Design a protein around this ligand. Structure first.
Ligand SMILES: CNC(=O)c1c(NC(=O)c2nc(C3CC3)cnc2Nc2cncnc2)cnn1C
Ligand SMILES: [Mg+2]
Ligand SMILES: [Zn+2]
Length: 313
């Protein structure tokens, strides 16, 4: 009960900032996650024994892939932590509990391949889940781990609070399917501009939580340039492997995944910042003004890619 997690001074201060990098020491990430749960939720939200067992089972079910790995899970949870801490009063106790767990669990058992590749491969998961294939798998894995003996971190919730939190986590994880982001943000854009956005409307909160999940999921584009640039290598290592696997199915991959077109990466990043990231953090900043630092950091990284193209690096 009286057992706080404490971090070294530098981490204690920087963990509160959106651009925090969780570092190369894997063994500190569980403690960093528990620290965030304690400050974001309370020291009572979860039985520490059960939370610790949950965290270590989640870690075990992330794979050793260059990007969609345990570090990504904790990184995406930290962004959600920073959003929740900068928007104290806007979110329920249930939402703060569910969303940190949703972020930790959102890419469970990722293999480093897109929904498109699963469908073209004719992977069994693509027969079981026609849309948001990996994301329905991720929620399935989350429920599976929650049901391991000693792993139900929600057992102290009432029956209806339990159903509500699993529904928050399900929508949160499904929302990380980028195919759904485009229409979700368009709808949120319309609602904010015509002034119909209403956070007491459950269907509207769902949409806002969805955008928060896209924003946390993409948060590697909101780090200091050296972090963003090195993470970009990790995600391209997965894209190129998928492109290799497309060529093995006798399909020319999209240029994003073709390692023969590495020269086109800088312009491909511009498209991605302009088509996805900048729009995502702009709408998020309009709805949740204290998330502006994510938009500023994202614009800084776009500018750095423009500099790469102009040969200045
Ligand atoms: C829809 N367009 C695209 O997905 C797209 C690209 N996607 C990315 O670069 C990228 N995608 C994602 C999730 C959607 C999988 C996450 N992070 C990404 N980039 C990144 C950069 N630096 C650090 N961390 C991450 C590139 N070119 N294209 C046409
Ligand atoms: Mg995912
Ligand atoms: Zn992710």
């Amino acid at each position: 009960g009286l057992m706080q997690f404490t971090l070294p001074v530098r981490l204690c201060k920087e963990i509160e900032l959106f651009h925090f990098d969780i570092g190369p020491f894997e063994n500190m990430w569980p403690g960093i996650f528990v620290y965030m749960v304690h400050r974001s939720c309370g020291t009572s939200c979860f039985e520490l024994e059960k939370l610790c067992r949950f965290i270590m089972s989640v870690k075990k079910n992330y794979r050793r892939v260059p990007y969609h790995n345990w570090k990504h899970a904790v990184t995406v949870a930290h962004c959600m932590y920073a959003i929740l801490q900068n928007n104290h009063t806007l979110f329920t106790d249930l939402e703060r509990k569910g969303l940190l767990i949703a972020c930790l669990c959102h890419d469970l058992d990722h293999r480093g391949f897109s929904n498109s590749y699963l469908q073209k491969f004719d992977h069994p998961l693509a027969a079981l889940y026609s849309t948001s294939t990996m994301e329905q798998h991720h929620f399935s894995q989350t429920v599976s781990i929650l049901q391991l003996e000693g792993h139900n971190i929600f057992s102290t919730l009432s029956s209806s609070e339990y159903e509500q939190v699993l529904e928050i986590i399900r929508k949160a994880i499904i929302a990380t399917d980028l195919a759904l982001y485009f229409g979700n943000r368009k709808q949120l854009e319309e609602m904010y501009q015509t002034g119909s956005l209403n956070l007491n409307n459950q269907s509207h909160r769902d949409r806002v939580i969805g955008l928060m999940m896209t924003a946390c999921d993409l948060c590697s584009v909101t780090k200091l340039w050296p972090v963003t640039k090195l993470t970009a290598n990790d995600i391209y290592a997965e894209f190129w492997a998928e492109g290799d696997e497309m060529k093995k199915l006798g399909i020319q991959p999209i240029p994003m995944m073709d390692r023969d077109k590495k020269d086109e990466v800088p312009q491909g990043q511009l498209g991605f910042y302009n088509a996805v990231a900048i729009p995502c953090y702009t709408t998020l900043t309009q709805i949740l003004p204290p998330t502006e630092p994510l938009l500023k950091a994202c614009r800084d990284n776009l500018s750095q890619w423009e500099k790469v193209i102009r040969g200045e690096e």
